[PDB]
């Protein structure tokens, strides 16, 4: 598979992965994420695990387990530090600790690397025997709920070195090494590959929507960060100069969100609000190229790899402006960054009145995708990390 990705690189970046691939051999690596199936860790993990093991690399990803309250106080944290909002009870964090003593019962951390994934296994670090231990952040950890933050920092405060997908998250109250590299899309991977019109075709008809009228699609969960309700008043505002546009909002399985989302939805049947299993990675592939406009207008986003994924597929992206968005999204470049559903929808209506300027923002979109954000640059900066931080351990 490697040797495929010369077309979108070139001879230099391969060869340079396969030197430090060389020097790596003798190491064992695991990571530890929360979820096997859905989400940007999981997609990305999907991609660049198998990527290292064909490059001879002893990879390994291991996922942790726990009962709903701990996926609730995951959530509760997961929030507190992007928002900086929200009271933690005291047991917050003794069913964390708790939970942190179980999975490191029930999983080997005898390895040269252990890559640690987002808040949910950052306590593992406690039971850390031999081998470099690097935390990767996937959120927004600039603003966060000091109390949260505090705990968390105890732990992060015990790796070799952290990794950020943007600079800006990089904290000055952290001693170790703090690497930025943002996540990447896999050009071949089912989720991003060319398809045929007939595939386009046949998926967009099967969920009921015209291939024939405009279609303006956000691909994320039913969650508050990806604020669906403001894509639907975003929607609503806009239709009123393109009546002939359609909305689809492209989720996977709170989700409290879905029914507010179908309420501020009501009295408009031209609003799509699907909900796909989490392994429909030709369905989204499909819809993003089905697209005239693609919006990912979060109020919080580590990354957000539909942004990339939008642009690689040639579409103008109107993302919100916080966190990796607007590393993706340049302004009047490769899509908008927006502050309210009001600015997003005079940049909706903007997008869709001017066919020449949407081409050349998705023209933009792919070659600043090229440039940045294709899973060979990731792989490539993820081997630096690892021979730099090893050599420091």
Known sequence: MIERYVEFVGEHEIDAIFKYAEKLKDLSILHVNSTAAGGGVAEILHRLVPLMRELGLNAEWKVIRGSQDFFTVT??????????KGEIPDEYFKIYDEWQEINAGEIPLDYDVVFIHDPQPAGLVKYRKKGTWIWRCHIDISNPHPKVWGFLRGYISKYDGMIVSI???ARDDLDIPQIAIPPSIDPLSPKNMPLPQTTVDRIVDKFGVDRE?????????YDRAKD??????SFRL??????????VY???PGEVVYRETVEAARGEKDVHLLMLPPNSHVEVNAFQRAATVVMQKSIKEGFGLTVSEALWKRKPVIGGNTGGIRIQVINGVTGFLVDSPK??????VYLLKNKKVREEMGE???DHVRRNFLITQQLRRYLMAILYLTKRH
Do not use: C, M, W
Not at 75 to 84: I, M, P, V
Not at 213 to 221: G, K, N, T
Not at 228 to 233: F, L, Y
Not at 343 to 348: G, M, N, P, S, V
């Open 213 to 221: 009228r405009p279609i303006i699609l956000q691909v994320s969960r």
């Open 343 to 348: 600015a997003a929808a005079y940049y909706l």
């Open 364 to 366: 933009a979109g792919r």
């Open 238 to 247: 806009a239709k009123r100069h393109v009546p002939d546009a359609q909305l």
């Open 250 to 252: 492209l989720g996977s």
């Open 167 to 169: 600079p800006e998250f």
């Open 228 to 233: 669906p309700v403001g894509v639907i008043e």
């Open 75 to 84: 959530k509760s944290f997961h929030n507190a530090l992007q928002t900086g």
